[PDB]
Amino acid sequence: ELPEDPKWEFPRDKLTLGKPLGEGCFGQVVMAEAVGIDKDKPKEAVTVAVKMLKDDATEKDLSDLVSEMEMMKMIGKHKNIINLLGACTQDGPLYVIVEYASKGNLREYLRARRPINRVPEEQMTFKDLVSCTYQLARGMEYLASQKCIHRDLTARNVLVTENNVMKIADFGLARDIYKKTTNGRLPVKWMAPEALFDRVYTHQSDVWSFGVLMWEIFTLGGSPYPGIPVEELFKLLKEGHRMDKPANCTNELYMMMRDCWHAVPSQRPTFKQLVEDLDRILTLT
Amino acid sequence: ELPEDPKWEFPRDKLTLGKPLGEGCFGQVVMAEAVGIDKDKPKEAVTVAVKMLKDDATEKDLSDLVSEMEMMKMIGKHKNIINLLGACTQDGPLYVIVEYASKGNLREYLRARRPPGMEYSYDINRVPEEQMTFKDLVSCTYQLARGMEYLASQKCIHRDLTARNVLVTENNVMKIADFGLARDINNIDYYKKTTNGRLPVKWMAPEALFDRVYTHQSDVWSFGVLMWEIFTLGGSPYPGIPVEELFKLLKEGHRMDKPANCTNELYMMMRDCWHAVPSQRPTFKQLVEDLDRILTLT
Ligand SMILES: CCOC(=O)Cn1cnc(S(=O)(=O)n2ccc3ncc(CCc4cc(OC)cc(OC)c4)nc32)c1
Ligand SMILES: CCOC(=O)Cn1cnc(S(=O)(=O)n2ccc3ncc(CCc4cc(OC)cc(OC)c4)nc32)c1
């Protein structure tokens, strides 16, 4: 029913399902051991993540999973994005096999390493936070070089591997170039004014979202425009209101966020420009 | 900005927010005490539920909340649906005030009242003193049939009739909820679907799935599945069978087997609901007749 692609196809009998990593609401991700998914050593088994449909999945969710799979093939390999490893498409339910990130999403990762319970031995230094940002800028610079927009860049959609590599995830809303559906399904506190009002999206709209992600990061998983409801945000952005500086954040980095939150997308930095500026700061730290 | 509607508008200073009842995927519902929302007794306070936007809300979620609010005004009052009590629309964030259902959604309600040892029974959530009898399940079904008969009499279709979207009050009254996908087909004889609809596939009638049409007889099919859900005490339909592999099976005439906790009669009612020709399915009127009859004999 779903067309064949031998390049990516993985045999079902070698995949072994495991514990659910999380239910996003339109999708389901489970841990799994996969034998010989790494072609260079066919005998060894490796822990992967498998996205599949819910039981209460809709008609739209099946095409969105396939769309996302197709997006992941043409994006190509990068260190700072979740990468496609394989798929089970034939004669069974659709399993999309992607890299495993053992330390979860960046929001929980950061909240867990703030200096209830759940707090580990390893807490976040300034150099560590800057290195998170720079890693994510590289990921996003790559996506932009592939003429691809993400449109859902949030801390919750960034995953962290065992070796604390930041990986950008969820290419659900991702598109190749954009004229919006007039009713796009994009989170409002991360959305650039153009995406919100003018139904357009460029790479410069992702830069704005990156602006908010930086704030998220330097508040160690804070939630943007705290206390301000979505209804009351539209008018504030039009008046030029922006978020204050996080406490564990230099004047320089804050100015980088504020550069990201220009209302005129061309006056914002490009991802290339952010990678330049963040490497510079990472070196000096 | 949101227009005035004095009939429904409620003053913000009298509403008192409380614990979050749930985080759904694109909604937030919190408990609240509201003073004088019932005009007939202005001094008394009542426990209500307030739907509002998440912090991580989308552009689409704002119109959907307002749309749903408007749907709830024209549907009117019934015992077996969640009813609109009021709204805060002016000079602040949008609070839609609806009836409170203290025992949660019907799926968790049923799983919590399964016998011990069952797949979904947890010691911390389980209420075995309120274990589910046969008459209790039939009474759930009948109550929901009445709710749905009402909706159909208002020439309204639900399109998302699932156990998770049925709530249970303190007095174990079944209330049909989520009018997000609900549509009015008063003038238009049926509903013409979009390509790639946002309806759950295992509850969807073949017409809705293949022919992009929806009538009240499509809701009957969904009710068929809800019955199965109920008599499996919150089971999930077509168990083991993935959505991909369901399309072909329905076209070949595959249907779900009888739940063990279910008579031959009730199963035949489900299968009547799952007829391939929507007119040969019972109407909600016909289900209410048949279920009352069975409820009386128990
Ligand atoms: C589509 C929803 O999942 C996400 O991509 C975003 N997400 C947010 N939180 C999570 S998780 O907490 O459930 N999670 C926790 C550990 C963990 N390890 C790996 C994954 C991979 C999820 C995934 C699936 C996937 O399937 C097509 C594509 C992806 O990148 C685009 C990423 N997800 C993991 C996942
Ligand atoms: C949209 C995502 O948010 C949800 O998960 C929707 N939801 C449906 N049931 C629940 S609940 O399990 O958290 N819940 C538990 C107790 C409880 N009491 C009342 C309500 C009311 C939900 C509601 C809000 C509402 O506001 C528009 C309209 C409704 O019916 C049409 C129903 N919901 C209650 C939540």
CA of A171 to the centre of ligand 1 (A): 10
Method of determination is X-ray
Same fold, A1-100 and A101-283: no
Q: Is B22 annotated as a binding residue?
A: yes
The candidate with the shortest Cα–Cα distance to A195, out of A207, A209, A180, is: A180
Cα–Cα distance, B180 to B176 (Å, whole number) = 12
The candidate with the shortest Cα–Cα distance to B230, out of B177, B193, B267, B199, is: B267
Place of tokens 């399993």: A95
* Torsion angle defined by CA atoms of residues A262, A157, A25 and B168, in that order, rounded to the nearest 10 degrees: -70
The candidate with the shortest Cα–Cα distance to A217, out of A94, A135, A116, A122, is: A135
Residue A136 near residue A166 (C-beta atoms within 8 A): yes
Cα–Cα distance, A125 to B188 (Å, whole number) = 62
Query: CA of A167: how far to CAs of A81, A145, A164, A241, A274, in Å?
Result: 4, 17, 9, 31, 17
For chain A, the domains span: 1-100, 101-283
Residues 84-113 of B with CB under 8 A from A: 92-94
User: Does the C-beta of A109 come closer than 6 Å to ligand 1?
Assistant: no
The candidate with the shortest Cα–Cα distance to A74, out of A65, A64, A83, A61, is: A83
How would DSSP label each residue in A79-134?
Answer: TTB--EEEEE-SSS--EEEE---TT-BHHHHHHHT-------S----HHHHHHHHH
For A63, nearest residue in chain B (alpha carbons): B196
Q: How many CB atoms lie within 10 A of CB B278?
A: 19
Q: Is B83 annotated as a binding residue?
A: no
Q: Helices B284-297 & B216-231, crossing angle to 10 degrees?
A: 30
* Torsion angle defined by CA atoms of residues B88, B93, B96 and B97, in that order, rounded to the nearest 10 degrees: -60
What are the residues whose beta carbons fall under 8 Å from the beta carbon of A278, sequence distance 6 or more? A130, A133, A134, A137, A256
Domain spanning A101-283, CATH class: mainly alpha
Ligand at shortest distance from the CA of A87: 1
Q: Which of these is catalytic: B38, B55, B56, B160? A: B160
Give the mutation target among A70, A170, A171 for probing the ligand 1 site: most ligand atoms within 8 A of CB: A170
- 3-state secondary structure at position A52: strand
Cα–Cα distance, B282 to B269 (Å, whole number) = 8
CA of B58 to the centre of ligand 1 (A): 20
Query: CA of B34: how far to CAs of A4, B16, B95, B132, in Å?
Result: 58, 6, 12, 33
Resolution in units of Å: 3.0
Contact with chain B for residue A177, Cβ under 8 A: no
Residues of B in contact with A154 (CB under 8 A): 56
User: Does the C-beta of A105 come closer than 6 Å to ligand 1?
Assistant: yes
The candidate with the shortest Cα–Cα distance to B103, out of B65, B148, B136, is: B136
Cα–Cα distance, A187 to A26 (Å, whole number) = 15
Nearest-atom number in ligand 1 for the CA of A68 is: 27
Q: Is A152 an active-site residue?
A: yes
Instruction: Tell how far CA A38 is from the center of its chain.
Output: 24
Cα–Cα distance, B247 to B89 (Å, whole number) = 43
**What tokens were used for B196?**
């790639």
Residue B205 near residue B213 (C-beta atoms within 8 A): no
- 3-state secondary structure at position A143: helix
CATH of domain B101-296: 1.10.510.10
Query: CA of A54: how far to CAs of A116, A146, B24, B201, B242, in Å?
Result: 31, 30, 15, 10, 9
Upper half-sphere CA count for residue A65 (Cβ side, 13 Å):
29
Residue B49 near residue B31 (C-beta atoms within 8 A): yes
The domain made up of B1-100 has a fold known as Phosphorylase Kinase; domain 1 (3.30.200)
Q: Which of these is catalytic: A5, A152, A277, A279? A: A152
Cα–Cα distance, B116 to B1 (Å, whole number) = 52
